[PDB]
Structure 1
Amino acid sequence: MNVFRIHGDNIIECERVIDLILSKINPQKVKRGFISLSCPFIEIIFKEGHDYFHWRFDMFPGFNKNDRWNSNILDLLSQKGSFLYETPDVIITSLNNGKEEILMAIEFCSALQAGNQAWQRSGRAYSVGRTGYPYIYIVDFVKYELNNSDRSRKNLRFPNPAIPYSYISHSKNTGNFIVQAYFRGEEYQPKYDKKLKFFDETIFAEDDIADYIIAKLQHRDTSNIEQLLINKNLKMVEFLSKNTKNDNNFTYSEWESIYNGTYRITNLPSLGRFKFRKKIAEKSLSGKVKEFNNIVQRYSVGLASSDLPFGVIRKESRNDFINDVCKLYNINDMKIIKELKEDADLIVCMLKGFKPRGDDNRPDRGALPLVAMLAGENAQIFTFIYGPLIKGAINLIDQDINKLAKRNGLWKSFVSLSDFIVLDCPIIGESYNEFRLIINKNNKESILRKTSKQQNILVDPTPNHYQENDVDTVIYSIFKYIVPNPPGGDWSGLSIIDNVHEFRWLSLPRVSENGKRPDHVIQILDLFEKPLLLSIVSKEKPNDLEPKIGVQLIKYIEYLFDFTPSVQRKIAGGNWEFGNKSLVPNDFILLSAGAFIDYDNLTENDYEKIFEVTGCDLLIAIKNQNNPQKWVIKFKPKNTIAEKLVNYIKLNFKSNIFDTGFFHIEG
């Protein structure tokens, strides 16, 4: 038998990996249960003809920020060079010789993001990619952005072709497998959207990703599977680049010449046919920012796009660019100028970095990683920042820049990848800008060698304490596996099924005017004459359940019922189509539930007060028993309908697959 561990941000993320495996693997024997109170498992026996295999997947929901688990699995990434504070959605490990070894990192993205949102999470791919551990970025193509007021669809937005290409270039540079894989989203409707007329459906990688995962679990040669996935990532670059105006963006022939190794991104013969022209909003301008931008536009050549936040100053024009920068900011020191004038191409990245109050820009954290993925981390990068800094930030820059990098993820990104950091920033509470020219070359070189303490890691299945993650794991296990077809809902979408169709609402907002998005929505069809939709919220303590949370969960489902579902499909047939017919709330029984951990500190009066405060129809008080390890579940119904649900759960707390022996239902 081989044992694997799925370390995820939550049980849903862990189960997504199992669903990928199970989509290709048709197992002969499947057994579910818990190895510990926090760790569910799935044990499978499957065969490849005559060859039988026995695997067990132990799931570890919720990553550390020794915070939750006794040791952090993410430490194995920082030991191999992942110096950014980047957490993927899932880490699959193999248990061998009493320790864990990372097989791959997986990140799930609900939509093909566009603009600076496309590279917002590029730090994850850059940092995990330079470790040698594969990084698989799985994105749904496509999901429409909605106007949350009326759920009407906004026009499709696509990332710059350089974003999907950065994964391929990072793969080439690092010798590691870093790829962007596209899964067919329910809203992929090419018959109705003209933007998708030239999309090649061979780019979809559902079968290929499952084949790759299974081959890695089997310790098989993945070279051929990797090449198929890389080719699909390259076809996305072709789809995107052939849909953009060639005048100020790279053509597919240019990307292809870089891909096949004919030229590097900085020695392209056609480099310069468009310049690097950074767009700065008027409201953002201060100090000598506008004149610096003019100096850049005087010597720059465009890198992939004329308006991306970065470009190249070729070594042939570097001396004149440096001379102009020194004349603008009154840099006279001969030692400083000598460092700036090194004979090599210079990549100039210009970022505001900070919002009006001095708070860091989330998308900017992936800007330098994107540059490093495209042109190599060893390339000389000149980072120019012009946004407002709080007095504490400028003080740390002049005292110990690494101390600032340690507290803030954006500063971490800047200090780790810039050879020169130039600030021309307003300081909050001060009348004028502060200028800094930081020769960060030695520091960057040291950071690119920094690795955390080498140590074998075996995450103990029992955490420091049980909290929201554990409540969520228990709620998901009971309602999704123990209690007996419908998908239900979560933060990614709500599905409602009948005898012919499945209706699905995508792009769920966190809140509506009167509602709050439930953690889980459970559909029960064989209890009442109408289907039941049970909306659940999970918290660590009963007092964490906010006032009227139960009423807000129902009002959220009522909000979705006010609109035609995003998509629908015939369960018997297939293929997702756009929503045609509206659903009616009277066709369903809606109930709300609040789940939490309670160690018998709640009296009859306390339960009565929780019901009065939250308005929940059902309260699920969960408590762990240590010897023997068991989850004691106490279901407290508020009314007669919820009591019928409690009886249904108690009667159906039986399973041929799930080991119900780990639970004790008091009532």
Structure 2
Amino acid sequence: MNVFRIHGDNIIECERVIDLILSKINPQKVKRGFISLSCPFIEIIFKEGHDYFHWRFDMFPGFNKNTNDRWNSNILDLLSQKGSFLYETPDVIITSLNNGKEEILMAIVFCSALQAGNQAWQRSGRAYSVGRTGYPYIYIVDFVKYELNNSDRSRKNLRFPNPAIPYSYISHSKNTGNFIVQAYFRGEEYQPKYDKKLKFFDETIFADDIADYIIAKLQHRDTSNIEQLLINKNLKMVEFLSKNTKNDNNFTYSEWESIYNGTYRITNLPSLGRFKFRKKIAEKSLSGKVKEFNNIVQRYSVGLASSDLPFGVIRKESRNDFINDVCKLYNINDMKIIKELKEDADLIVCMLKGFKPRGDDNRPDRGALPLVAMLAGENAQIFTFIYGPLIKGAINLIDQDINKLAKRNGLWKSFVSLSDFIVLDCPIIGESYNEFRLIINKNNKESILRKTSKQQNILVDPTPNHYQENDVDTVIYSIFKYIVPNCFSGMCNPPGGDWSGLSIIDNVHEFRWLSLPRVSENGKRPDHVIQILDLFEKPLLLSIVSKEKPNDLEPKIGVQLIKYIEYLFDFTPSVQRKIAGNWEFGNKSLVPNDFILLSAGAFIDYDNLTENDYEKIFEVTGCDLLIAIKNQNNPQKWVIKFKPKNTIAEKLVNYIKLNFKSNIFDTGFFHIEG
């Protein structure tokens, strides 16, 4: 037998990897259950012709935020040990268990939509940091999903990321020698007959290639050829994007192609200089000598990928003059500092506001230097210019020990790890005029790029410090997705809903609402929506919220869950398909009176609730059902108590009790009190 672990942010992310495997593997036997209270498993017997395989996948939901926060050891330490120095967490890590320890096979990130603008690089630190470890980094995204005006669920026009973002994965792969890729799955809203922006999309960009790659990695087989097919699709996405943008201020596909095939490097393109680097700065952001610094950059710079990306190049042939102008502007007279600035090499200049008016850091700026390092290499000389307001404590730490600031803040960690020179021309909150700093960070950057955490083997123990909201979620998901409907995968019975979308089925169609907001005017997005069709004359939609403790259930949460479903019913489903037949745009609106809507709050309670406490929770939340869960340690069991508010919820409880049976799931790990 072979055992693999799937460490995920939650049970849904873990199960997405299992669904990808089950899309290519058709198993002879499937068994589900728990290896511990927190860790569900799926066991499969399958064959490749005459060759049988027996695999078990043990799932670890909820990552640690430190070394012993939830789990006794942090699986993420395996990434820090290989050079992942940014505080970055993927969605899933898949490991192989051998000789009492875990070995990472890959890191996977799932994204619902191809993000655009600075949101495209906001989390680029993940791909950069995990990419430099040698462990494969797979970014999977749906192409396309429409952004909506939440007021009326009307679709906004499609926006695409700058072609340099998808390209960065390709360049990061080449620079490191590791497999870092962006893969695209056909979204339900990919409808090219209704949107002219998709006219030239090559449908061969859509990735069985991801399931093939995962299975070949699980089998310890050669994946070089599958990797090339995926890289080819990533490149064809850059082709689609660059051929749809204007060539005057952006790299053309033939320029990207000449970099990809190794003819030229991104800084030695023969056409470099046809557009300059022109950073756009809002007039309200200006202070000190920022405008004059931007003029000096635009006097010497050559564009890198796009004229208005927040970075560009100062070629070594112009570096002396650029440095003389900066030194004259900021009164830098120190002979030794000027020599450091005048090193005879190309200089990447990155310009970022960094901070909002109250000195709180810009999230998108965290990915700017990782994006530059993925495109140009981490050893490229980077001059980072910051002009946003700094709180007094931040400039104080810059003057005492910049690494102290980098240790506590992700933005400062990105700046300090990747910049050779950090220049600040910042307003200081509480003071009338800007502060100027010129930090020679070369030696510090070099030290960070060699740093790795303590080498040590990891075997995460399946018993966490304590049981909390991740465990409540795993239990709720297992009961309503596998035990009560009698399913073994995500592709089964009514799909229901979660944070990523809501599906409602009938006798002929599956209707789906995509792009669900966290809140509506009177509603809150449920953690899970369960559809039950064999209980009442009308179908039931059970909306559930999961919390660590009963007092974490907010006032009117039960009513808000129902009102969220009522909000969706006020609009045509995003997409629909015939359960017998392809996804199309939603055509017909659904009727709420055709459904019974109930709400439920789930939590962990160690028998600290009286009849009056339960009465108070019902009054506060308005939930139709409360699900009180508690673990028993000897023998390990989850004891479930279903508390109905009314007669309708009581019928649901009796239904759950009657159907708490399964040929696939080991229900023996549960005890339903009533």
Provide the TM-score with structure 2 as the length reference. Answer: 0.98
Residues 203-238 of structure 1: per-residue CA shift (max 9 Å, x gap)? 000x10000000000000000000000000000000
Q: Aligned partners of 2:653, 2:185: CA distance in 1, in Å?
A: 38
Q: Aligned partners of 1:443, 1:413: CA distance in 2, in Å?
A: 13
Residues 232-282 of structure 1: per-residue CA shift (max 9 Å, x gap)? 000000000000000000000000000000000001111000000000011
Match runs of 1:211-610 below 5 Å: 211-484=212-485, 485-572=493-580, 574-610=581-617
Q: Aligned partners of 1:357, 1:54: CA distance in 2, in Å?
A: 57
Q: Aligned partners of 1:174, 1:89: CA distance in 2, in Å?
A: 22
- Structure-2 residue corresponding to 1:51: 51
Q: Number of aligned pairs? A: 665
| SS of structure 2 residue aligned to 1:622 | strand
Q: Aligned partners of 1:396, 1:652: CA distance in 2, in Å?
A: 61
Q: Aligned partners of 2:156, 2:209: CA distance in 1, in Å?
A: 31
**1:89 maps to which of 87, 91, 102:** 91
How far did 1:374 drift?
Answer: 0.2
Q: Aligned partners of 2:502, 2:663: CA distance in 1, in Å?
A: 27
- Structure-1 residue corresponding to 2:130: 128
Residues 510-553 of structure 1: per-residue CA shift (max 9 Å, x gap)? 11111000000000011111110000000000000000000000
| SS of structure 1 residue aligned to 2:593 | helix
Q: Aligned partners of 1:580, 1:495: CA distance in 2, in Å?
A: 15
Q: Aligned partners of 1:663, 1:387: CA distance in 2, in Å?
A: 55
Residues 414-444 of structure 1: per-residue CA shift (max 9 Å, x gap)? 0000000000011111101111000000000
- Structure-2 residue corresponding to 1:202: 204
Residues 546-596 of structure 1: per-residue CA shift (max 9 Å, x gap)? 000000000000000001111111111x41111100011001000000000
How far did 1:459 drift?
Answer: 0.3
Q: Aligned partners of 2:60, 2:362: CA distance in 1, in Å?
A: 31
| SS of structure 2 residue aligned to 1:536 | strand
Q: Aligned partners of 1:54, 1:611: CA distance in 2, in Å?
A: 47
User: 5+ residue gaps in structure 1?
Assistant: none
Q: Aligned partners of 1:198, 1:571: CA distance in 2, in Å?
A: 30
How far did 1:139 drift?
Answer: 0.5
Residues 286-331 of structure 1: per-residue CA shift (max 9 Å, x gap)? 0000000000000000000000000000000000000000000000
How far did 1:483 drift?
Answer: 0.3
| SS of structure 2 residue aligned to 1:568 | strand
Q: Aligned partners of 1:27, 1:72: CA distance in 2, in Å?
A: 32
| SS of structure 1 residue aligned to 2:654 | helix
Residues 78-102 of structure 1: per-residue CA shift (max 9 Å, x gap)? 0000000000000000001000010
Residues 482-526 of structure 1: per-residue CA shift (max 9 Å, x gap)? 002010000000000001000001110111111000000000011
Q: Aligned partners of 1:606, 1:565: CA distance in 2, in Å?
A: 39
Residues 327-383 of structure 1: per-residue CA shift (max 9 Å, x gap)? 000000000000000000000000001111101111100000000000000000000
Q: Aligned partners of 2:576, 2:282: CA distance in 1, in Å?
A: 42
How far did 1:478 drift?
Answer: 0.1
Q: Aligned partners of 2:545, 2:470: CA distance in 1, in Å?
A: 12
| SS of structure 2 residue aligned to 1:220 | coil
Provide the TM-score with structure 1 as the length reference. Answer: 0.99
| SS of structure 1 residue aligned to 2:183 | strand
- Structure-1 residue corresponding to 2:490: none
How far did 1:2 drift?
Answer: 0.6
- Structure-1 residue corresponding to 2:488: none
| SS of structure 2 residue aligned to 1:231 | helix
Residues 57-89 of structure 1: per-residue CA shift (max 9 Å, x gap)? 000000000000000000000000000000000
Q: Aligned partners of 1:18, 1:631: CA distance in 2, in Å?
A: 23
| SS of structure 2 residue aligned to 1:237 | helix
| SS of structure 1 residue aligned to 2:453 | coil
| SS of structure 2 residue aligned to 1:448 | helix
Q: Aligned partners of 1:427, 1:493: CA distance in 2, in Å?
A: 44
Q: Aligned partners of 1:388, 1:215: CA distance in 2, in Å?
A: 50
**Is 2:641 aligned against 1:661?**
no
| SS of structure 1 residue aligned to 2:450 | coil
Residues 94-147 of structure 1: per-residue CA shift (max 9 Å, x gap)? 001000010000000010000000001110000000000000000010011100
Residues 24-75 of structure 1: per-residue CA shift (max 9 Å, x gap)? 1000000000000000000001100001001000000000000000000000
How far did 1:182 drift?
Answer: 0.2
How far did 1:196 drift?
Answer: 0.2
Q: Aligned partners of 1:643, 1:513: CA distance in 2, in Å?
A: 30
Q: Aligned partners of 2:354, 2:96: CA distance in 1, in Å?
A: 39
CA RMSD of aligned residues (A): 0.4
* Structure 1 stretches of at least 4 aligned residues deviating more than 6 Å after TM superposition: none
| SS of structure 1 residue aligned to 2:620 | helix
